[PDB]
Design a protein around this ligand. Structure first.
Ligand code: C14
Ligand code: C14
Ligand code: C14
Ligand code: C14
Ligand code: C14
Ligand code: C14
Lengths: 51, 51
């Protein structure tokens, strides 16, 4: 029983973490505002739809 | 008299136009926000202090 409970707990925890960090989709264009980049810059991902 | 008046008028008009457009100094770094440039970009002048 403990093993089954822990399996479910880990599954739920990983799903929640993924939802918080990324969501469940990826966009083609990303806006970056981190040094040393000046102001904001546009970046482009690889294979967003397939992913 | 008319010629002297017009000389002075033209001088004042040109000074006012220059003050409105540029001022009386130039900075080394310029911020550009015009298409097709994305977001804002930084540009650098030539010989700002001498000018
Ligand atoms: C000797 C008892 C073995 C049964 C273990 C079932 C519980 C496993 C919990 C896993 C916790 C996470 C470890 C990385
Ligand atoms: C089963 C794995 C648990 C891992 C817990 C780690 C938490 C990750 C950090 C949470 C977000 C921090 C944002 C500052
Ligand atoms: C069993 C439920 C499966 C449906 C999950 C749908 C998640 C939302 C995905 C939205 C993607 C839209 C394309 C950008
Ligand atoms: C025949 C009279 C000549 C005297 C002319 C003095 C006035 C000049 C006015 C200039 C106006 C701007 C012309 C471009
Ligand atoms: C003696 C020369 C007179 C020239 C007058 C031209 C005015 C210049 C335009 C004024 C600024 C327009 C901002 C939209
Ligand atoms: C007769 C008065 C002459 C003084 C004019 C000064 C104009 C202001 C210039 C400021 C430049 C400061 C360096 C960026």
């Amino acid at each position: 029983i403990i093993s089954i409970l822990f399996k479910s707990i880990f599954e739920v925890a990983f799903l929640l973490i993924q939802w918080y960090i990324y969501g469940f989709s990826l966009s083609a264009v990303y806006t970056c505002k981190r040094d040393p980049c000046p102001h904001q810059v546009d970046c482009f991902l690889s294979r967003p739809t397939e992913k």
